Amino acid sequence: LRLEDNYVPTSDTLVVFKQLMKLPVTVLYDLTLSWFAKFGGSIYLLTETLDLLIEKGVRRNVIVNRILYVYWGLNVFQLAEIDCHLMISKPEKFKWLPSKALRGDGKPYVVKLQPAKFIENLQTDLAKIYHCHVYMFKHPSLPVLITRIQLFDSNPLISRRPYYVAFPLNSPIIFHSVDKDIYARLVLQSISRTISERETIIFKPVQKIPVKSIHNIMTLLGPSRFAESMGPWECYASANFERSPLHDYKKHQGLTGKKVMVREFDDSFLNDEEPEIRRLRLEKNMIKFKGSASRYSSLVPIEKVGFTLKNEINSRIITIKLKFNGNDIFGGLHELCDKNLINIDKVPGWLAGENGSFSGTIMNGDFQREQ
Amino acid sequence: MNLKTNNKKRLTEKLIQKDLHPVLNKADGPVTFRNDSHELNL
Amino acid sequence: NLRLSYLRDHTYPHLQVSVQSRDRVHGIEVLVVNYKFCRNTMNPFEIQFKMFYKFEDSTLLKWEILRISTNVRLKAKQLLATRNFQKCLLSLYEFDKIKSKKTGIFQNLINLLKRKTRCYLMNNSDSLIVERVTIKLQINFIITMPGECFLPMSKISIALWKGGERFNQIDLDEICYGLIKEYGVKTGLKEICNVCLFPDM
Amino acid sequence: PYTWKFLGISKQLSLENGIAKLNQLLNLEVDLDIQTIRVPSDPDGGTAADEYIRYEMRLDISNLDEGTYSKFIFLGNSKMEVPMFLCYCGTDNRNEVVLQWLKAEYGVIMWPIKFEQKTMIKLADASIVHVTKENIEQITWFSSKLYFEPETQDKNLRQFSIEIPRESCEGLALGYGNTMHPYNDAIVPYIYNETGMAVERLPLTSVILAGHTKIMRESIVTSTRSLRNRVLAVVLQSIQF
Amino acid sequence: LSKEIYDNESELRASQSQQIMELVGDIPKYSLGSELRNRVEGEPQSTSIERLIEDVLKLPQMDLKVLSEYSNLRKDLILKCQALQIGESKLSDILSQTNSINSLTT
Amino acid sequence: STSDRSELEDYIVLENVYRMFGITFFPLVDPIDLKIKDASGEIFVDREMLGIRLEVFSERTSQFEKPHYVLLKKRIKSNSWFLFKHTIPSFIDVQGIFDDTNGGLVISHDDAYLFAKRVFLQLVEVQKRRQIFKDLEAKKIIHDLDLDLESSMVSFFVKDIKVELFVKQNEIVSCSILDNNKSKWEIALLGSLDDLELKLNHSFA
Q1: What residues in B contact F114, CB-CB < 8 Å?
Q2: Nearest 5 degrees, angle CA A9-CA A163-CA A224?
Q3: Which residues of E55-90 are buried (b: 16+ CB within 10 A; e: fewer)?
């Protein structure tokens, strides 16, 4: 009962109209060409009709009436393509949630999957439980694989919410869309069973707070140089400070010297002009909250962060519980420091932005995440 | 559970078994081998 | 000065690097430099290189060898045709480290076995043979420079003799493999010569 | 749930006279006790600029509803620049008619009191100093939850909170030393030392304790009806010039 | 009546499903490797001798003539992978030896 | 400052010839724990930090690649480094290798150098696995192909056949031919990685 692409579901036409109105004209032309090449309905004779239509500069409404009333829902595969192109177009609408892939002792396992044989295995594992249809494509810019898993029910077939699972190419961290119903656990457990094929893999989730876009979660926790530094160590993730040993020595930071400012270490902040010193103070704040040199937003916007500082004075465990909120936390913190409200001499590393989107405690001066 | 009981039975019959000179000095053991093996490329 | 101290003392001990000269043409740069691997003070071997930068759009075009101290020259003859000098420098340094560790292990074993029974070295230093009563034990330690991983990998095998003939090799290889796996290198060899003694147990 | 709004009073006045005019305008009877209270009754005050005259104008009515129940706690001193103020709760119309009578009869100037940051810090310091009958100040503790609400570009950082549990607060207080001011000598230097966030300059909104009080920038929400002496002493000290 | 008929036939079907699942195992699944069941289901499209070696040592041992033939073939394949490992290590040794010889001659 | 300029230039070119090795230990200090001792106004470092600069040198383009950095910070109560902020991508497992070296605890400098050398061998293996396929492309023996980020799974084209390779550490384990001679051609190309370059001319001649 694994549904093929030629099956058509029963959905409302106006919501597909509303979805397909959120796309440009050339992707609609590509979609019409691919659907007529694969399925058709009502060769190259009908192609010049749309070639002449897009040359005249028509609106999107007449061409979306064309696509919705030469096929009259279209099918399950066409809906999957529409929704996946909508995911490619506007990435700010979704919400990802990462999860690691452990095996055996606890060593991480790179997935290294192939898009061909994985799809039929996932479908023949899921079809023994529910009605299902999967669809897997490659992101055109970022090197990830986005898999759209859709499920159905019988009161003909009432659709469910489509569930996304994003595989990066060479990382043991697998993103899935944020859900907590029994279908989400079923799909994630089925993928954890069918991706292995030699030795068993489990999916311990590494985070509990969702993050917004796929570029952000890819830069945070995918295969990238920014995967761990992420904060004041952002200079080491781009290497803009050193050159190769085969470079010139005349243009070297050892020979040229960088303009620096003498720090203050006495308590000279609670007792409160020269625009070069003002520019150096803004450069110091830019160094501490970011890399070397809009204008407040960081590399990645982080939604929610909750810290915990468990210090120890005279054998007393003194806990505090910082919590944050908003659109971009560390950018707003850099803005608040830029207005001379936070003494940047005493801002620790975990507050500064490193180990971003990780809400964990601190036990004697070294960060550790929370389960 | 069968592997757990078989491991316990094997440990008890090895405790009766005779390994006096070459084994009983460790029965710091496998960690220095892995250290010197990934050092000397053994 | 502190960065050169961290580069010289802490991360490459007993290595004598000294730059010699440099020159530019109109946009390339030449550099002659020598290394003196001085971990073995009894016979330290040296080498001399000559590199040609592009010096902007940073590229290595020409690099070659000026002179080698004739102690590893035949062994380096296979490795110095790969045209990848990073493998050459790291392989020479790892060879010096491995040879110093090997001669330290053999000096430890001879200083602990020179009392009870006899001992003598072999071909260059690659194998060590002890004898008793007769019964002989041969331990092999071969350092193989790479050619056609790239670090110089070592090989350890042992062999016994009961006076009449050599023993079987499969059981001795399994025993020495398990004993090195379980005890180590500096401790496993002491255990294997103690079990080839076998006076009591 | 008794939200205490705060208003100012321009001129020093007595309240024993003219109250019968309020009774005639109101057709009710109210009791106005004259408590000549004094802050830190411990003798390290000099008995000068430490006493106040409190006029708890209660409304002894049927207590079936709390939103119509409204006290009027007053304070005064004949030595400072601005001598008096009041604070009212409830949602009655009697608050409006009595502020009408106070504006009409004595001829004074009323205005709402907005709070500073160090004023909120001193109020959180004073709202936990409990007075017992044995002439000493025992200090309870509460798991305080501070709050902030700054405004940044594109609403980057909307609101963020610092929560300190009770045992940690007691540990910081016992580790600082013996003093009557924990929240201005121990915790705020600790937050500045371990975070760098000076809470005197950051925009405070709601210093909230563990269900006991809720200090805001425009009002004070409590759980019991009464308000302590040091709280009104700190408030009256704050509005001076 | 049809519901009771179905319930009686399901109660009869339960004993049949328990008996036909508790038959002779005939070396069943979840006991071999990936490559053994992939060669069972046909067209694996990816051969890999290392996984065949690591999975052929995982199969158990056991019309007794075909059982003897299976155990003989199992011993034969065990000897195959044994000789494969021996020949690989010996070929590496021979290649190192002739590399030293080529270095000397050059 | 002319003689000191020439001395600093010699120091910089010495740093360059040491950095051409690949594994260097540059000093570092975390700017938050620069505590003042208040005995003379001087500044001592509370928690020491030691930065490893891994740098793989290519051969095809004959230039140094982007160097990966590993940073180690000493713990406050154990006198052992723990891996603070590394920049290696996550297909090369770093935390498990740091737990595996010397039983988890790393004390001396050469104990860290062993971990740096292991990660260096992994990086150079990945780099050579990418380079050999890129030069097989540049020699035009193969058609257009796709590479992974670690060059462990590639798929190229020959004149008729689509070929998939899944390669382990510098030797090929799983192959795939897709489009009884196919099985012989499948097992024939299995082996080393330069053996693939030799055996591709054995079937495309």
Answers
A1: 35, 38-39
A2: 140
A3: bbeebeeeeeeeeeeeeeebeeeeeeeeeeeeeeee
| Contact indicator for F45, F32 with CB cutoff of 8 Å | no
Tell me how far the alpha carbon of residue D128 is from its chain's centroid.
12
Residue burial F125-155, b: 16+ Cβ < 10 Å; e: rest: bbbbbbebbbebeeeeebeeeebbbbbbbbb
Are the beta carbons of C84 and F57 separated by less than 8 Å? Answer: yes
Q: Tokens 């009191």 identify what position?
A: D113
Q: Crossing angle of helices C85-113/C188-197, nearest 10°? A: 40
Residue D154 gets which letter from DSSP? G
What is the amino acid identity at position C104?
Answer: G
Contacts of residue A12, defined as CB under 8 A and 6 or more positions apart, other chains included, come to none
Tokens matching residue A207: 């985070």
Closest CA to A198 of A104, A98, A99: A104
Cβ contact A257:A245 at 8 Å:
no
Tokens at residue D96, please?
């409006």
Reduced to 3 states (helix: H, G, I; strand: E, B; else coil), residue B7 is: helix
Q: Which chains touch A (3 or more CB pairs under 8 A)?
A: C, D, E, F
Q: How many angstroms away from the CA of C10 is the closest CA of chain B?
A: 17
Best residue in A244, A246, A247 to probe C by mutation, most C CBs within 10 Å?
A246
Amino acid at C168: N
Experimental method: cryo-EM
Instruction: Name every chain F residue with its beta carbon within 8 A of the beta carbon of A254.
Output: 8, 11-12, 15
D174 touches chain A (CB under 8 A): yes
> C-alpha distances in angstroms, D238 versus D50, D214, F123?
14, 18, 66
Q: How far is CA E66 from CA D199, E32, E74, in A?
A: 85, 19, 12
Resolution (in Å) of the shown entry?
A: 4.2
Closest CA to F53 of A242, E90, E27, E23: A242
Placement of tokens 């709601």 in the chain: D206
Q: Is F198 on the interface with E (CB under 8 A)?
A: no
DSSP percent split of chain A into helix, strand, coil, nearest 5: 35, 15, 50
Cα Rg, chain B, nearest whole Å: 15
Cβ distance C148 to E96 less than 8 Å, yes or no, reads no
Contacts of F113 (CB under 8 A, 6+ apart): C11, F23, F25
Alpha-carbon gap, residue C69 to F186, rounded angstroms: 48
Q: Which residues of chain E are within 8 Å of residue F164 when distances are taken between CB atoms?
A: 46
Measured distance CA(D190)–CA(E75) in Å, rounded: 74
Backbone angles phi, psi at A353, to 5 degrees: 140, -10
Helix, strand or coil, per DSSP, at residue D70: coil
**Interface check B1 vs F, CB under 8 A:** no
All partners of chain E with 3 or more CB pairs under 8 angstroms:
A, C, F
Q: Contacts of residue C59 in chain A, CB cutoff 8 Å?
A: 246
**Cα–Cα distance, C51 to D180 (Å, whole number):** 74
Kindly report the nearest CA distance between residue C150 and chain E, in angstroms.
Answer: 14
Q: Could you write out the DSSP letters of every residue in A100-140?
A: E-EETTTEE------HHHHHHHHHHHHTTTS-EEEEEEE-S
Chain B residues touching F97 at Cβ < 8 A = none
Q: Among A322, A325, A342, select the one facing D196 at the smallest CB separation.
A: A342
CA F11 to chain centre: 27
